Amino acid sequence: GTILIDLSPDDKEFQSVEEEMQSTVREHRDGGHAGGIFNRYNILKIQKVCNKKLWERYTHRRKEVSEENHNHANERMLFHGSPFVNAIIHKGFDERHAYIGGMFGAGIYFAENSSKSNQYVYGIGGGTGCPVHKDRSCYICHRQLLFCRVTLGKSFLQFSA
Amino acid sequence: MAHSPPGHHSVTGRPSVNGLALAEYVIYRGEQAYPEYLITYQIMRPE
Numbered sequence: 675g676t677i678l679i680d681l682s683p684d685d686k687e688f689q690s691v692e693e694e695m696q697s698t699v700r701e702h703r704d705g706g707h708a709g710g711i712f713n714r715y716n717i718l719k720i721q722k723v724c725n726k727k728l729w730e731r732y733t734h735r736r737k738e739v740s741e742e743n744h745n746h747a748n749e750r751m752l753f754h755g756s757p758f759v760n761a762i763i764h765k766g767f768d769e770r771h772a773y774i775g776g777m778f779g780a781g782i783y784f785a786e787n788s789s790k791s792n793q794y795v796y797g798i799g800g801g802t803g804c805p806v807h808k809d810r811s812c813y814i815c816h817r818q819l820l821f822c823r824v825t826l827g828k829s830f831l832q833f834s835a
Numbered sequence: 836m837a838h839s840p841p842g843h844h845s846v847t848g849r850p851s852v853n854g855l856a857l858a859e860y861v862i863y864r865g866e867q868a869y870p871e872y873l874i875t876y877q878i879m880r881p882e
């Protein structure tokens with residue numbers, strides 16, 4: 675049920691998504707070990723993910739949450755990096771996409787910093803890097819991130835290092 | 836998959852040491868996220 679629609683680089687929607695991607699890069703405490711050493715990206719393509727069933731699944735849940743939280747879904751746009759991006763765009767997020775050993779328990783993790791999600795594209799801790807060169811800092815291989823609509827509802831605040 | 840803390844729909848991980856880090860978030864139901872954009876990119880080697 676999923677189709678992917680390419681956005682033109684001239685499209686304001688392309689430009690606003692690119693700007694979120696580039697503007698939320700930061701340096702990481704690992705010196706680049708997981709995600710590589712970089713200050714910016716070369717954006718090759720931005721596609722809209724269209725799936726009616728998955729969208730209706732999302733909006734159904736969004737309304738449940740909203741109704742439990744004074745009509746406030748607390749919806750954000752956040753990044754997700756994963757080896758499973760292909761399954762996600764076809765079948766949706768589920769328990770198979772959870773970070774079992776995450777610091778806030780087994781759930782599905784999202785970041786405001788695109789460079790944080792970049793650390794997970796090749797797996798936890800960057801895995802062994804790109805499949806072709808086994809380089810976590812590969813400047814050649816094409817990477818993919820998701821920019822996702824996420825319903826937070828009432829969110830439990832955890833202060834953390 | 837774990838459950839949200841009772842009375843909550845997600846967890847927010849607020850950075851408490853690295854002043855430049857933005858927040859990270861966790862949901863415990865896959866139906867609470869929709870993958871709206873697929874971005875294909877390369878990281879760029881600093882000059």
Ligand SMILES: COc1ccc(-c2cc(=O)c3ccccc3o2)cc1
Pocket residue numbers: 753754755756757770771772773774783784785790791792794798859860
């Ligand atoms: C299934 O293995 C995964 C998949 C994705 C992630 C993932 C993907 C994220 O984008 C992410 C963002 C902030 C903090 C942790 C993060 O973790 C982790 C484990």
Ligand SMILES: [Zn+2]
Pocket residue numbers: 804805806807808809812813814815
């Ligand atoms: Zn490579």
